[PDB]
Amino acid sequence: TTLAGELVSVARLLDREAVVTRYLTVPAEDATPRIRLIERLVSGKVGAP
Amino acid sequence: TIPADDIQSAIEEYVSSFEEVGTVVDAGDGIAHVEGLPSV
């Protein structure tokens, strides 16, 4: 249930900043900086899985 | 919830984080579009 709550909250967070969604949604091969970005966003904010 | 307006730092670093290869996405009539290559 908290998975659902946090996932819809971070969905609100994505629709709140469109530019970061554009950036993390690049169809590129070496996507690793992207993943850093996302954890940089909620490193200590949400659950690990 | 929303962070303390540090999002720009995140993205600006994502950009500052930039052997490079791109991929053709479109082609026709002698004109192509290339995704990738952040430093051309």
UniProtKB/Swiss-Prot annotation, chain B:
Localization, UniProt: Cell membrane
Domain of life: Bacteria
Oligomer and partners: F-type ATPases have 2 components, CF(1) - the catalytic core - and CF(0) - the membrane proton channel. CF(1) has five subunits: alpha(3), beta(3), gamma(1), delta(1), epsilon(1). CF(0) has three main subunits: a(1), b(2) and c(9-12). The alpha and beta chains form an alternating ring which encloses part of the gamma chain. CF(1) is attached to CF(0) by a central stalk formed by the gamma and epsilon chains, while a peripheral stalk is formed by the delta and b chains.
Functional note: Produces ATP from ADP in the presence of a proton gradient across the membrane. The alpha chain is a regulatory subunit.
Family label: Belongs to the ATPase alpha/beta chains family.
The protein's name in its UniProt record: ATP synthase subunit alpha
Gene: atpA
Shown segment, full-protein numbering: 5 to 50 of 549
